[PDB]
Design a protein around this ligand. Sequence first.
Ligand code: ZN
Ligand code: ZN
Ligand code: ZN
Ligand code: ZN
Ligand code: ZN
Ligand code: ZN
Lengths: 286, 287
Amino acid sequence: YRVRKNVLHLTDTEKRDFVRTVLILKEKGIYDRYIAWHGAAGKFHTPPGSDRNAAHMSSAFLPWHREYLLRFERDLQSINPEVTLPYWEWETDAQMQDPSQSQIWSADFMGGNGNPIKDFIVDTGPFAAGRWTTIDEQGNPSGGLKRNFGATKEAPTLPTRDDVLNALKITQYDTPPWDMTSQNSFRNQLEGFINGPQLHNRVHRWVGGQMGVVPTAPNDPVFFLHHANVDRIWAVWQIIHRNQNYQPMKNGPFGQNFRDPMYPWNTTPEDVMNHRKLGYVYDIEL
Amino acid sequence: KYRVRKNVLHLTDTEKRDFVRTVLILKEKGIYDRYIAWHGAAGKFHTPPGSDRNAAHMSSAFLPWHREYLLRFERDLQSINPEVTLPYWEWETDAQMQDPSQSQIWSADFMGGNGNPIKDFIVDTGPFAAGRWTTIDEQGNPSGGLKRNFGATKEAPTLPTRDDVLNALKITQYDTPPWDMTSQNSFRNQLEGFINGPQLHNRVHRWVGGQMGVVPTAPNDPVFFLHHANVDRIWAVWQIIHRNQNYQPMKNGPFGQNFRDPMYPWNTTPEDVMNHRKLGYVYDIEL
Ligand SMILES: [Zn+2]
Ligand SMILES: [Zn+2]
Ligand SMILES: [Zn+2]
Ligand SMILES: [Zn+2]
Ligand SMILES: [Zn+2]
Ligand SMILES: [Zn+2]
């Protein structure tokens, strides 16, 4: 099936085609759908007055994003059928002396860190301001992609391989009360609220700029590379604990159970439980 | 072309009780709120960004979008009770009344009455009265109870008429460029209510007041759906009268406004809902 590859193993040509396909999606008005859907789920609380939302801080975090990526990728392939979504393996970059030296940040791919004299506006790469129009929380143009690697003092480093390995050991998908306080929960740990920010959250913070905030995060195309890695880690977790399943199955908040629709779609967690049936694998499976 | 949408005033007592019962179950289950959020979400999705248009309002997709919105809503009613369809509030008939607050739509067995002035204009009668029903703000958080204040503004002290509707139906083009509020000689713009407005659809929102008066919160009032069934019926009428005209723009409009563009927040295109009969429903008038 479709193979999702480590960013570091992409050809320069596979690289160029992905960037180019993302630019075509932006130009068409399609990319903005993804920014919007994500901000909208972020405001949709399950139940209202609570601190879970459709896409974060609860059991749906993982399948929600798997669905998001699947949809994103099909759109990619409507433009170019040879393109799949790659993943950013940040736990290896965390190894590098200077993470900000990773080739993912090359001018030919995601482009670079922000310019501190311009308020951390990004001015190298295909998504530099003037080449890529971002949208503020309201749905209007915002003036340009920003990034500020490792500057947030609580998230100065990327997650390590050991962080990923320790998460892979948790036997449970998730526990009550199915939120950011869930303990011994693979979901809450991979998401990063288990004494973090760690893993998923930590990467967001580390990148800074739009990636640092929920409502604006997907303005940075690297959002999708980050999330493919989270999805990958979940896929590996499911392979290991083959007899473990999504929790909760029932009785949890509406929108959070195995067969509830995940706003803003009708897709349920159960629809996306098996990634191979969605048509794709990660190169490591292989 | 079998499921039948009936005029509110033509519903039996059984029908009214069962429609209200279904809406209350939708709410409890958590499904109704998906509808409030969708509408809000679309209100903020500008086509294109910066523009005055959005996915659901002030442009060509206004009609198809709310048609798709209602269809999804109906499907969910029917998953609670397959006998239940979405009725329409024929407001142009209520507009004749000396006091429209006395329509049966506003009865305690159906939509409940007007806001209570003594108490910040909160609805205190009907199944949707404060304490019986909880509203939700633009932010996605609990916002107290329902509010209405009929005709409390000078921009819209009255409900559109029969003549207003008739004027709209005469119009030849579904819509005209630039496919926004400034469109002229356009059925869509006129119906939505921006031509020498606020009139028709907009006017009605303003007439009711409370949450119905502002885009992001309007669907907290279940009357929002009765009103839009009426808007959709008028469109369905216009499509028959003008059997030689189609939707606009077919192409080269902003993305999300064209005939085969997906309508955020769904993948549904205007084309998908152009013929309401093929969607499995008619209005009691199309007999
Ligand atoms: Zn939480
Ligand atoms: Zn997110
Ligand atoms: Zn995220
Ligand atoms: Zn509007
Ligand atoms: Zn509306
Ligand atoms: Zn409306």
